[PDB]
Amino acid sequence: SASDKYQKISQLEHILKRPDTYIGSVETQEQLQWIYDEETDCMIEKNVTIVPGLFKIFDEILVNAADNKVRDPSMKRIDVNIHAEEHTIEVKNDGKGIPIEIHNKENIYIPEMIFGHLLTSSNYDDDEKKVTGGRNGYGAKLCNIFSTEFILETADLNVGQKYVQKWENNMSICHPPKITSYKKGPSYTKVTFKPDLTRFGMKELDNDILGVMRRRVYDINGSVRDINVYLNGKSLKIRNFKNYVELYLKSLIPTILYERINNRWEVAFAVSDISFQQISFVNSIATTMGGTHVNYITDQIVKKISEILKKVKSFQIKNNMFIFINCLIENPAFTSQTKEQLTTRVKDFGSRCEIPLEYINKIMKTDLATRMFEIADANEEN
Amino acid sequence: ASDKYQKISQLEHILKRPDTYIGSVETQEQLQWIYDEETDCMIEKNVTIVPGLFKIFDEILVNAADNKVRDPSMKRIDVNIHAEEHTIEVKNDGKGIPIEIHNKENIYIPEMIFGHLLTSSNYDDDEKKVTGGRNGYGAKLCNIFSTEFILETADLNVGQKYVQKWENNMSICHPPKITSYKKGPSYTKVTFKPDLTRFGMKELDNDILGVMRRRVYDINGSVRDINVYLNGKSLKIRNFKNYVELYLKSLEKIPTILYERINNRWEVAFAVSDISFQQISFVNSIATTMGGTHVNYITDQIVKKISEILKKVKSFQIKNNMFIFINCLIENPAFTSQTKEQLTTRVKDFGSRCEIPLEYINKIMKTDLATRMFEIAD
Numbered sequence: 159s160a161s162d163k164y165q166k167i168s169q170l171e172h173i174l175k176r177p178d179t180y181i182g183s184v185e186t187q188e189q190l191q192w193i194y195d196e197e198t199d200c201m202i203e204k205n206v207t208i209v210p211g212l213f214k215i216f217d218e219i220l221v222n223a224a225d226n227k228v229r230d231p232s233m234k235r236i237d238v239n240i241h242a243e244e245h246t247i248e249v250k251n252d253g254k255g256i257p258i259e260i261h262n263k264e265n266i267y268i269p270e271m272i273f274g275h276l277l278t279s280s281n282y283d284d285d286e287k288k289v290t291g292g293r294n295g296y297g298a299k300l301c302n303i304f305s306t307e308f309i310l311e312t313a314d315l316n317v318g319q320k321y322v323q324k325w326e327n328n329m330s331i332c333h334p335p336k337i338t339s340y341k342k343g344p345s346y347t348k349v350t351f352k353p354d355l356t357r358f359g360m361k362e363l364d365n366d367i368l369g370v371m372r373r374r375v376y377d378i379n380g381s382v383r384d385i386n387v388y389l390n391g392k393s394l395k396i397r398n399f400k401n402y403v404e405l406y407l408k409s410l411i412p413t414i415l416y417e418r419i420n421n422r423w424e425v426a427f428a429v430s431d432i433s434f435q436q437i438s439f440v441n442s443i444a445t446t447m448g449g450t451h452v453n454y455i456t457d458q459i460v461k462k463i464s465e466i467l468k469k470v471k472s473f474q475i476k477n478n479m480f481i482f483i484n485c486l487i488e489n490p491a492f493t494s495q496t497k498e499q500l501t502t503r504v505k506d507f508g509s510r511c512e513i514p515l516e517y518i519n520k521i522m523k524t525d526l527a528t529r530m531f532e533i534a535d536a537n538e539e540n
Numbered sequence: 541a542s543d544k545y546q547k548i549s550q551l552e553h554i555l556k557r558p559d560t561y562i563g564s565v566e567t568q569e570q571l572q573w574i575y576d577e578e579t580d581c582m583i584e585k586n587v588t589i590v591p592g593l594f595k596i597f598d599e600i601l602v603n604a605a606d607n608k609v610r611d612p613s614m615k616r617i618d619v620n621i622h623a624e625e626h627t628i629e630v631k632n633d634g635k636g637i638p639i640e641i642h643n644k645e646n647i648y649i650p651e652m653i654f655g656h657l658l659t660s661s662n663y664d665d666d667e668k669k670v671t672g673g674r675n676g677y678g679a680k681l682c683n684i685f686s687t688e689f690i691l692e693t694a695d696l697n698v699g700q701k702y703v704q705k706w707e708n709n710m711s712i713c714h715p716p717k718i719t720s721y722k723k724g725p726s727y728t729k730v731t732f733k734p735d736l737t738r739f740g741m742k743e744l745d746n747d748i749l750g751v752m753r754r755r756v757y758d759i760n761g762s763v764r765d766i767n768v769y770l771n772g773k774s775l776k777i778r779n780f781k782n783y784v785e786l787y788l789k790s791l792e793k794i795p796t797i798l799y800e801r802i803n804n805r806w807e808v809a810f811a812v813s814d815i816s817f818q819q820i821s822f823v824n825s826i827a828t829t830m831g832g833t834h835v836n837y838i839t840d841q842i843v844k845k846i847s848e849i850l851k852k853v854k855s856f857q858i859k860n861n862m863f864i865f866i867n868c869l870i871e872n873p874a875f876t877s878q879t880k881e882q883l884t885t886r887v888k889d890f891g892s893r894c895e896i897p898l899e900y901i902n903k904i905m906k907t908d909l910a911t912r913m914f915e916i917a918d
């Protein structure tokens with residue numbers, strides 16, 4: 159039947175039917191993932207089985223909180239509470255909350271608009287060059303859509319009110335907001351959600367997902383300047399990106415060479431054991447598939463090393479490198495909503511990052527150089 | 541606050557933020573293969589092209605190839621590129637689009653599936669399908685990025701012909717012209733004029749024309765039992781081995797290419813790479829230029845065995861001497877994005893397996909790859 163064969167569906171129906179291009183796979187995946195080990199106080203690489211979409215909806219909320227540091231530089235604190243037994247996750251940030259006002263076009267409260275309707279954002283005017291992670295106006299709604307319960311709480315000092323709004327059943331139930339007088343306290347936003355574990359094929363939050371979620375909170379402390387992050391009330395202790403990269407020290411002439419190149423670029427280098435490795439952040443987004451920023455940095459290092467060597471194949475140099483990058487890119491573009499891979503051309507970054515000769519010279523003091531010299535005179539022998 | 545926060549439509553968002561739908565609408569400097577007509581072979585060239593423009597064309601091509609999955613009686617695809625008039629025509633035979641009013645939507649079906657987002661015949665995954673179409677965007681994405689978009693189709697069930705024109709990024713939809721058709725065969729024809737200025741272009745230059753043309757050779761290579769015509773010329777690629785062999789001259793510049801059909805859903809070819817790892821792969825006729833799980837599945841098998849042989853050197857040394865070609869069929873595939881450049885489907889969900897025979901890996905151990913690896917080892 160022609161009418162049965164050709165189907166039209168709503169955008170909301172499509173998201174639930176086909177999560178992949180919105181939040182990534184809802185099937186279990188075997189992955190090698192970095193985990194923060196509390197018994198040894200360091201990052202360890204572990205074979206885990208996780209559902210990427212579940213990890214992603216958490217990440218969407220985390221990155222929104224980090225984005226608030228950009229809009230409000232006075233923001234000091236992010237709290238992440240994971241209540242595994244209760245299947246609830248809370249992310250709270252201080253600094254400016256959400257305006258408690260009726261939108262003069264949409265005729266609803268702004269928090270209801272931007273957490274309860276697709277395609278809503280403060281990031282749609284690209285005349286402003288912004289270094290927020292937020293771009294498309296989907297993130298928070300995707301979390302809501304994949305939650306059985308989703309609660310937004312915010313306090314607005316301009317009106318002196320607190321606003322609490324609950325959605326249920328994959329954003330399909332939207333309860334009216336509870337608005338109360340709020341005097342003589344700080345602004346903040348708190349997002350609480352209970353992921354719809356049925357849609358992720360799970361019955362509980364297991365040790366693998368909790369492990370990667372917790373590490374992602376370390377990432378946030380590592381990548382966002384001048385904030386204090388707490389996990390279930392406990393300080394993560396690290397204060398900057400250098401401290402973050404140092405958590406990898408045990409698993410990795412200094413082992414780690416770190417440099418802030420400018421106010422938008424920090425780079426660290428270590429020698430890799432097996433092959434090319436990268437850990438990179440764009441506006442606090444974890445770019446696990448790398449992209450133009452990673453290639454920009456590594457190409458430079460490879461080119462400069464190669465030139466010193468010729469005075470070997472490029473993949474030979476590259477694959478002895480473990481690179482860490484924390485960068486701020488203007489109005490970035492990615493291959494997908496998950497933002498695993500940056501596609502912004504270098505000329506559109508809004509900044510440059512030239513790696514200085516002094517840094518390259520320091521790399522030439524590491525095992526990387528020894529390994530390349532071996533390849534080199536073997537190539538001469540033949 | 542009201543000005544700080546905005547709600548936009550799906551259609552506004554696509555034009556505002558094309559990247560997750562069709563890829564970048566900015567120029568990209570790329571190494572790309574093109575078919576050199578004078579030498580009758582593939583040549584690697586530095587080009588500057590806008591991926592989104594290449595992609596809207598690819599959406600229409602793969603749709604035509606999908607019609608061969610749906611109707612195995614289909615025999616030909618015609619592509620006509622009219623560079624001067626920036627017009628592109630893609631015609632296939634076999635079953636057309638049903639000229640019926642939809643039960644629910646109350647409009648003609650072709651209007652529905654070419655002129656409204658989120659419309660598809662691929663939404664029911666109870667059926668295990670080997671089409672490339674998955675999400676119900678591709679054809680609409682082409683329409684949206686066109687100044688003018690024309691669907692022509694004829695169905696023999698009703699004995700009619702249906703012609704409908706959209707304009708101005710799909711915003712103008714003209715009523716269909718439906719006429720009596722007792723004439724020849726069923727067919728569908730899509731004619732569009734890309735909104736070139738939206739891609740920052742004045743005209744279809746030689747770079748984009750070269751990759752568009754190569755992509756048509758790709759289709760002939762990856763899809764069996766069809767004739768493919770480009771601007772009137774029969775391409776006549778016999779099979780996937782013939783397609784791979786188009787790369788022979790540039791690679792040759794112990795056979796140069798080792799080809800094997802593994803089974804009915806998997807074909808692989810191998811050549812030695814001079815600079816780094818290279819792959820050309822297709823999943824259900826989609827060009828998976830960013831690879832993914834199928835490429836990893838094949839290369840891991842090869843690298844793992846060669847590693848054991850050398851052990852009797854790091855895995856990256858082996859992999860970076862490989863040029864792999866893969867043509868495969870995957871059930872209900874999943875990708876990272878609408879552009880379908882990277883497959884994410886797990887091997888266990890493929891619908892088939894591809895165990896590379898040890899004698900094939902033995903043939904690989906006769907090439908320059910082994911000589912190079914043994915010099916690192918010994």
Ligand SMILES: Nc1ncnc2c1ncn2[C@@H]1O[C@H](COP(=O)(O)OP(=O)(O)NP(=O)(O)O)[C@@H](O)[C@H]1O
Pocket residue numbers: 218222223226251254255256272273278279280281291292293294295296297298299347
């Ligand atoms: N913790 C927060 N504090 C302040 N504003 C927030 C917070 N979380 C979300 N927002 C606002 O809500 C809007 C919607 O969030 P979101 O759905 O994630 O879209 P986005 O961040 O703009 N883009 P994207 O994440 O790429 O889909 C954002 O644009 C912010 O303006």
Ligand SMILES: Nc1ncnc2c1ncn2[C@@H]1O[C@H](COP(=O)(O)OP(=O)(O)NP(=O)(O)O)[C@@H](O)[C@H]1O
Pocket residue numbers: 599603604607632635636637653654659660661662672673674675676677678679680728
């Ligand atoms: N040349 C064609 N012949 C027959 N049917 C077609 C043709 N092109 C498109 N269709 C039909 O039109 C629908 C819409 O096409 P399209 O927008 O490209 O979606 P899709 O191919 O199903 N999914 P996707 O391409 O992944 O976004 C398809 O599902 C097909 O049923």
Ligand SMILES: C[C@@H](CN1CC(=O)NC(=O)C1)N1CC(=O)NC(=O)C1
Pocket residue numbers: 176179180294296495557560561675677877878
């Ligand atoms: C790519 C688009 C959604 N996508 C669904 C799909 O399967 N194909 C499309 O073209 C549209 N995306 C949704 C989202 O979460 N964020 C965006 O920016 C647009």
Ligand SMILES: [Mg+2]
Pocket residue numbers: 218221222291292293296297298
């Ligand atoms: Mg966001």
Ligand SMILES: [Mg+2]
Pocket residue numbers: 599602603672673674677678679
């Ligand atoms: Mg399609």
